[PDB]
Amino acid sequence: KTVLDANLDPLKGKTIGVIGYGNQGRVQATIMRENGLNVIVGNVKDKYYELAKKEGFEVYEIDEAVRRSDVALLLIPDEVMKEVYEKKIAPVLQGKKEFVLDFASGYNVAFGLIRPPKSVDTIMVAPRMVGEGIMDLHKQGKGYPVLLGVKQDASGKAWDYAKAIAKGIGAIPGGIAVISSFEEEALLDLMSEHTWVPILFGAIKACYDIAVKEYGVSPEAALLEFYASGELAEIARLIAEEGIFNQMVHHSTTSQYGTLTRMFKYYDVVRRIVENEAKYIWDGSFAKEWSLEQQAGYPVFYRLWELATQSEMAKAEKELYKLLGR
Amino acid sequence: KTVLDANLDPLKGKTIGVIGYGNQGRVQATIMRENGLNVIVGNVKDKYYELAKKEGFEVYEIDEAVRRSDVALLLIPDEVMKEVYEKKIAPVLQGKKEFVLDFASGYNVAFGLIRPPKSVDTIMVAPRMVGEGIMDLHKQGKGYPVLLGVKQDASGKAWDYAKAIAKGIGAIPGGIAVISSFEEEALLDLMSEHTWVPILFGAIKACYDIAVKEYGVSPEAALLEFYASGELAEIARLIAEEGIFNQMVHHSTTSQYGTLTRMFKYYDVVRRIVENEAKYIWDGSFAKEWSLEQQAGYPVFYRLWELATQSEMAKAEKELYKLLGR
Amino acid sequence: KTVLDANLDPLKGKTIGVIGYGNQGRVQATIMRENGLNVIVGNVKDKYYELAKKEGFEVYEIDEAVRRSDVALLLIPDEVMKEVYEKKIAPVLQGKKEFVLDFASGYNVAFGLIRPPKSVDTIMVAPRMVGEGIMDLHKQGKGYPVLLGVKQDASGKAWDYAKAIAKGIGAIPGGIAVISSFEEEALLDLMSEHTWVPILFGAIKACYDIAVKEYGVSPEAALLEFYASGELAEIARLIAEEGIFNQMVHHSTTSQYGTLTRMFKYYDVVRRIVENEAKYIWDGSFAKEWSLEQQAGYPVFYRLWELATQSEMAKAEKELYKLLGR
Amino acid sequence: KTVLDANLDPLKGKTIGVIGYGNQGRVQATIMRENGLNVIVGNVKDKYYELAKKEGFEVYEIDEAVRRSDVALLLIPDEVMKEVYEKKIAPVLQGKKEFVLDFASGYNVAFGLIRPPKSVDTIMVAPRMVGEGIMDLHKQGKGYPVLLGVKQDASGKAWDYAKAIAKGIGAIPGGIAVISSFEEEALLDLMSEHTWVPILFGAIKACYDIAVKEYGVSPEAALLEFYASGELAEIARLIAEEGIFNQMVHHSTTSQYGTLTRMFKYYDVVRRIVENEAKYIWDGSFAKEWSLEQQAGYPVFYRLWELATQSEMAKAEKELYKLLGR
Ligand SMILES: [Mg+2]
Ligand SMILES: [Mg+2]
Ligand SMILES: [Mg+2]
Ligand SMILES: [Mg+2]
Ligand SMILES: [Mg+2]
Ligand SMILES: [Mg+2]
Ligand SMILES: [Mg+2]
Ligand SMILES: [Mg+2]
């Protein structure tokens, strides 16, 4: 039901352009040069221009590297992807006949902010790691999971181009390739940022104001319990390797009774928050909200970085980290 | 306002018994034998009986090691601490004249479940690490934070006994010693288990049921986003070393806008949960609830481990971990 | 999908102990002695000690009858089952190698109050009759329904031991054997006692206080309508033989219009009571409530038998039954 | 705690440019030319181009007057300040080394709409008068209050540059200089426009509709009571000179009982409006609302000037002012 291996025969002998030499563009082009392809770097005249030339490539302009290529990969950030697509790549794709356009994110295509023509294939390969964990894993010989999806179907060879790049960048064999969509890629990525990450940061911030202002706990002793000691980054290492419920048997018996009995008690309070944030993404309403913040000139993003770093909990964290040598 | 150094002169030449050779007893007795004290092991006739004799000690009985000692340390778990105190140590402490009783937890004394006489000192030294991170730190020459507190004051040397054991087990110099209470030690330890740990596990469990049952995401692709990839144990390593708001500048600009604007929106919903769980602990009502679960014979603890490990999210995690080699 | 016949060949030639000679122990051991097995009685030195010796058996002690046996049946009440298991049977089961432990109830094992070792099989055969209707049925040659379930699986012959005792006590052939669980046996038994039996007794008690105190009906004429005439035990005999909706065509046409139109009107009021009482059982919360009533010394059970038998409806029932010769 | 005098020695001998010759630019440059500085006018080629040349100055271009200057003052309106800063002044400030940028408003800098470099000082001098009351008070020899604030601190001379312009434009000596912020300057200015000014205009508009439509008061007699007689501009002249509670003793005794007893009765109704409007400003949400009204092309500003000047209260005010000779 999931993919474990593929071919590399559909994409042999042809030119594989890579636009952008940022963080994701360096690792994915390094493992393709070892597998023996024709990989060229299309980069803006930047500081990355020299650092991609002395690493053993040939570097060009963006709209020129699409003219030579037959399969291009758009590894540039999502904030600048829209205004450099219409100015550089969009005049060139109408001068081609067949093309394969590849995306590492699913945000600008699921919400219709970038609409390629009908003469091109649009596929997606999306790694679930960070990039500074992938180069440190390629020396071993293992892989990493990816998510595949196809939006516009032109050739009939569309699904067998996507599996081959999953085997060309060093994900399979050794990892999992799951068949997904463009809309299910963008929903799951913006559900982590909206549902369980701001409830976690807002509950450690709320434990600090109840302990210090109501019960008279010292401001230097509340920090060492909640997050300034690395006990949250120790019980999270066991989740990745043993399970989420099976890492609980290495705790006290008093700890398992208070965690299990309260997880089932506050379950339908936090379920009503996830139902409302997933409806706000799926209709396209968050993509309109963040597209009008970038046009007003970020007035709310600026005032919420001021109110967070100049608070009571962050002003006391600064001194305690000026005392443990960090 | 906090302690950075102490002496070892009040506790030189005298016998320092250690009751229990579990996890916390092995590390704390090892760093005291190197500092040059008279450390004896009081252990039950167990599997730890041999393993503490071949490690270079002298093992005895529990009520005999209190007769020889003058400063005893009770590094035994809190579940069995009450019924082995009244049967072994309580008949002996009335036969002494002066004694220093030391506790690594603040649960049984803050709620009055163990009440020592008026002829004894009662102090507390409570390390904020795990034990399997402390022995791996002793070869460096560094320290770790501790919390000090005094319940019953007999000598007048009561506060200067507590600082010396903080320097005798290898915490200071190099770390922090914070002055605290027995009641503020037990409040902060049961606020992690009741407020932000079951909110976090119940929000990843609720993201899985909304994504799979409403939007048609695959059961093997929802797991790789939320917790089965080690991205929760990567962004938690930066919290311990850089801060909680300063680790966010290594994320995307779209990720900081969705985290900051929702952390301030769901702040008074999760603040009403922390106000109610801290009142339930401070009155002593959780200590009555967990003391009557152990007497009925754990009927609710047994039925909540069945309903958690036989759910929809844990039955699919078993298969995916039977596919990535874990 | 259900069982209609089995064998008796797995349990021939071996000793079948029966613990307790109460109501369920007398009937089940009588139909097994006729089928030709080795049935011994393990009874406390009681009044049943003589009455099981003159009925043609050999009576022993409880912990001695487990030493001789290989398949034991625990037909003792659930109130005393826990404190006579740990004192008598639990020291002996570790001295065996293979054993089959059999239960006629599913209460103490589903909620984890009795946890046998991993070296033993645990099965269940649960008859849905009374015992004083089974001995009066054995002369006919018919059967009665039973429920089978297996908790811990050791041999692989575990499911074929359970079917054979269903045929050995005289249930099949001629009746139904349904495959069930230990948790589904305890849920359905405590749903009759909590949902539809106290609603029925509390609605005849509420018809008596509205008729007598508001409309001036005589206290001796309200009783003869609601329950003191045997019409509730006449329309219930047709439910067992004809159906629950098909017994209504032997009533008046005015009676079927008032029963059908009000059964659909009060259906979601009584559905909210059953949803809440089934959640209170499944989590294990009723087993904690009844285990702490037996430890306080029954103070609420004593005061609710006083308030029920000294009420207005029970004081007037006493005189009317002192007038019809009952 | 407040400032009463300063120096003029940090800013002697150097060039003080003034951008814009509007209302605030004409008065502030006139009192600086008398104090003996080097004041040049940077104005757009406008109608003010001639009117600032015949008044005894030297007029230039905007980006040329920043090249000559060393301390520039931006006395231009806030609506056009953003799009003439990035086109003219922003290319020049990177060609300098040290500069002092001065602002008479705190709107565009507090909300991050104009972010100067790190090589420049940013200060603020904000007068609390009108401009057509300041020139009429320069012939007397008096002063007027101002608010000082510093955003980015570069040289260490930043706070003593701000006090000297407070003495150089003719505020101190004789007036008050209060030390404030950029965020506290923008909060207090938009709290007058949002809280107590639209409540006042909406309560005289609501007195007119209740008196005329319910009680049959003439439309020409309701106007002469509420605002068309100059009694609101008479009891407001005593607030500035005598107090807000001490001007009430020149009223009737019936008037003081109805004002005092209702001011304390409707106090928590109007306190809930001020709490909500001050949270909407501080987060930066009003700055996003007014920045997207100017981009849609003012569709709501146009329709609310139509609905206000074509109402029942403004159509009858037009005729009554066509009868008293106004
Ligand atoms: Mg993620
Ligand atoms: Mg992302
Ligand atoms: Mg903790
Ligand atoms: Mg603990
Ligand atoms: Mg029943
Ligand atoms: Mg029963
Ligand atoms: Mg104002
Ligand atoms: Mg203004």
Side-chain angles (χ1 to χ4, degrees), chain A residues 11 44-45 90 118 120 128 140 158 181 189 201 205 214 242 249 253 285 317 319:
Chain A
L11 75 174
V44 197
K45 298 203 147 287
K118 314 191 53 84
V120 292
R128 303 284 108 171
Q140 314 291 126
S181 297
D189 174 45
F201 289 156
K205 185 178 183 292
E214 269 71 1
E242 200 158 20
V249 286
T253 312
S285 303
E317 173 210 288
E319 321 166 359

Side-chain angles (χ1 to χ4, degrees), chain A:
Chain A
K1 48 186 192 316
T2 80
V3 189
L4 279 86
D5 206 8
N7 265 266
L8 269 78
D9 292 308
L11 75 174
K12 188 47 74 181
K14 33 185 64 166
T15 317
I16 318 290
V18 176
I19 320 288
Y21 208 78
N23 196 295
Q24 282 268 0
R26 183 174 56 201
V27 168
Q28 291 206 351
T30 313
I31 315 163
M32 279 197 297
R33 192 178 52 180
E34 309 318 282
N35 266 328
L37 300 160
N38 292 257
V39 184
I40 59 186
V41 162
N43 198 53
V44 197
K45 298 203 147 287
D46 206 327
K47 187 264 291 181
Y48 290 157
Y49 207 101
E50 45 166 320
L51 310 190
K53 201 46 166 293
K54 74 199 90 194
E55 284 217 349
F57 272 109
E58 48 183 0
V59 176
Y60 301 117
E61 300 218 310
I62 289 174
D63 53 349
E64 181 71 27
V66 164
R67 291 161 188 161
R68 268 188 283 268
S69 308
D70 279 356
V71 170
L73 270 57
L74 206 62
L75 299 155
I76 46 180
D78 296 21
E79 285 83 48
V80 306
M81 193 200 278
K82 190 182 172 195
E83 205 74 19
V84 308
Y85 164 76
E86 320 274 349
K87 300 297 174 301
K88 313 273 195 55
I89 301 167
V92 178
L93 290 164
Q94 318 278 350
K96 296 299 217 67
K97 39 159 299 184
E98 48 165 359
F99 206 81
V100 193
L101 193 50
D102 185 277
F103 295 101
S105 198
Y107 183 81
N108 294 270
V109 195
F111 295 112
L113 305 158
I114 289 169
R115 320 190 189 198
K118 314 191 53 84
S119 67
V120 292
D121 259 347
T122 56
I123 65 174
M124 175 191 64
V125 292
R128 303 284 108 171
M129 274 169 100
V130 306
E132 61 168 30
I134 307 172
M135 182 178 175
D136 308 319
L137 166 64
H138 183 236
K139 38 197 289 202
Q140 314 291 126
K142 305 307 294 151
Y144 55 101
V146 287
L147 287 164
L148 320 173
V150 166
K151 169 108 191 187
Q152 187 74 16
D153 215 314
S155 291
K157 252 284 171 194
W159 266 105
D160 297 277
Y161 277 132
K163 297 178 188 167
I165 316 182
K167 211 191 150 201
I169 66 179
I172 55 183
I176 318 185
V178 189
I179 284 180
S180 183
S181 297
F182 262 92
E183 294 89 40
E184 307 176 9
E185 161 66 47
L187 178 89
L188 296 165
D189 174 45
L190 308 165
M191 271 176 96
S192 313
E193 314 163 3
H194 294 207
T195 59
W196 65 261
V197 171
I199 301 175
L200 168 74
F201 289 156
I204 311 180
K205 185 178 183 292
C207 283
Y208 183 87
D209 296 79
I210 296 298
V212 177
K213 275 87 201 177
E214 269 71 1
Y215 296 101
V217 186
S218 307
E220 315 284 90
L223 289 179
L224 292 179
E225 167 68 49
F226 295 133
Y227 71 100
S229 158
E231 49 204 77
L232 195 153
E234 192 265 320
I235 80 166
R237 195 196 51 116
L238 305 156
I239 294 179
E241 74 200 316
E242 200 158 20
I244 186 180
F245 297 129
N246 295 339
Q247 48 89 22
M248 294 219 66
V249 286
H250 307 278
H251 287 270
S252 178
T253 312
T254 317
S255 297
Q256 306 174 44
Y257 183 75
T259 303
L260 277 170
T261 46
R262 267 84 196 159
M263 186 188 56
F264 286 116
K265 174 180 155 79
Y266 299 128
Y267 173 66
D268 67 343
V269 176
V270 307
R271 193 194 167 86
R272 293 181 271 164
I273 301 170
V274 184
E275 290 209 77
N276 300 331
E277 293 298 318
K279 292 189 282 224
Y280 195 65
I281 293 168
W282 197 249
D283 313 330
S285 303
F286 175 74
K288 197 206 160 175
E289 163 176 356
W290 174 235
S291 299
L292 296 175
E293 174 82 8
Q294 304 179 275
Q295 291 175 357
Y298 313 94
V300 196
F301 193 29
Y302 183 83
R303 291 285 316 157
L304 289 189
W305 264 105
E306 286 202 299
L307 294 176
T309 64
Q310 296 285 316
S311 45
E312 293 270 61
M313 197 199 65
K315 268 171 181 161
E317 173 210 288
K318 188 182 308 156
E319 321 166 359
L320 182 88
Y321 276 57
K322 215 190 312 295
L323 193 54
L324 283 155
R326 270 148 167 170

Side-chain angles (χ1 to χ4, degrees), chain B residues 21-218:
Chain B
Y21 208 78
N23 197 295
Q24 284 264 3
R26 186 181 55 203
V27 162
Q28 288 205 353
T30 312
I31 319 161
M32 277 199 295
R33 194 179 50 181
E34 308 319 282
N35 264 327
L37 300 157
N38 292 257
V39 184
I40 59 187
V41 161
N43 199 58
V44 202
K45 302 204 142 283
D46 207 327
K47 199 261 296 184
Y48 291 156
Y49 203 92
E50 58 179 0
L51 307 192
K53 203 49 173 283
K54 63 198 90 193
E55 284 217 352
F57 270 111
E58 40 181 2
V59 63
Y60 297 119
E61 290 219 320
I62 282 180
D63 53 349
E64 181 71 26
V66 166
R67 291 161 189 162
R68 258 187 287 271
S69 310
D70 273 343
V71 172
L73 269 56
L74 208 62
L75 305 148
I76 54 176
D78 295 23
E79 285 84 46
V80 307
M81 195 202 273
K82 191 182 171 196
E83 206 75 11
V84 311
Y85 164 76
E86 320 274 348
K87 299 296 173 301
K88 314 270 197 55
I89 301 165
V92 181
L93 290 164
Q94 319 277 350
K96 300 298 222 71
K97 46 160 287 194
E98 46 163 0
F99 207 79
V100 193
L101 200 42
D102 185 277
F103 295 101
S105 198
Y107 183 81
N108 294 270
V109 184
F111 295 112
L113 305 157
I114 288 168
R115 322 191 189 199
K118 313 190 55 86
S119 88
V120 292
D121 257 346
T122 53
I123 65 174
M124 175 191 64
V125 285
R128 301 288 97 182
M129 283 186 74
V130 302
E132 59 164 30
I134 305 169
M135 195 211 155
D136 313 322
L137 180 54
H138 186 231
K139 42 203 272 192
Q140 316 290 129
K142 306 307 292 150
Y144 53 100
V146 283
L147 287 163
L148 322 173
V150 166
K151 179 70 182 291
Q152 190 73 20
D153 213 323
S155 294
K157 190 60 76 175
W159 264 106
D160 298 276
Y161 277 133
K163 296 177 189 164
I165 317 182
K167 192 180 171 184
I169 67 179
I172 55 183
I176 320 187
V178 187
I179 284 179
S180 200
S181 295
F182 272 94
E183 293 89 40
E184 308 177 8
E185 159 68 44
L187 182 74
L188 296 164
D189 175 44
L190 309 162
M191 269 175 102
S192 313
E193 315 163 2
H194 294 207
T195 58
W196 64 261
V197 170
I199 278 177
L200 167 77
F201 288 157
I204 311 180
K205 187 180 180 291
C207 281
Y208 182 87
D209 286 90
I210 296 298
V212 177
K213 276 77 179 175
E214 268 74 2
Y215 296 102
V217 186
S218 310

